[PDB]
Amino acid sequence: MYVRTNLTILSPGWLASMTSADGTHAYEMQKSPVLLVSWHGKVMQLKVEG
């Protein structure tokens, strides 16, 4: 999965991490349905299915 976000990924690991000046971040991620995002200090979990 190739994800464009304004947020960042914390837990599972990363392979390619592109980041622009305006805060747009591109993350290359392996096939994982569960992710954890650290929004401004507090971490919440997201689950994505097909």
Partner 1 sequence: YGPNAKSMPTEEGIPPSANDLLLHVLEGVPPPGSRRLVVSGGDARAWLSNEK
Partner 2 sequence: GDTGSLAGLQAMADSKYTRAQKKQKMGKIREMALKETALSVGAQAGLAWRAKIIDEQLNKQARNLDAIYDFNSLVLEHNILPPVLLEGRNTLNLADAQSIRISDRTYKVAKQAHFITTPPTWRQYLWMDYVKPEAPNVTLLPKTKAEKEIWCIYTERGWKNGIDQANTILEENIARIKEDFGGMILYRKLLAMNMVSPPYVSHTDLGVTGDGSEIHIDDRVLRITALPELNVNSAEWRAAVAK
CA-nearest of 3, 2, 9, 16 to 38 is 9
User: Segment contacting partner 1 (CB under 8 A): 9-17, 31-39, 41-49?
Assistant: 9-17
Q: Given candidates 2, 21, 31, 45, which one binds partner 1 under the rule CB under 8 A? A: 21
Question: How far, in Å, CA of 7 to CA of 9, rounded?
Answer: 7
CB 23 within 8 A of CB 6: yes
Tell whether residue 32 is a contact of partner 2 (CB under 8 A).
Answer: no
Tell whether residue 39 is a contact of partner 2 (CB under 8 A).
Answer: no
Chain residues in the site for partner 2 (CB under 8 A): 8, 10-15, 38, 41
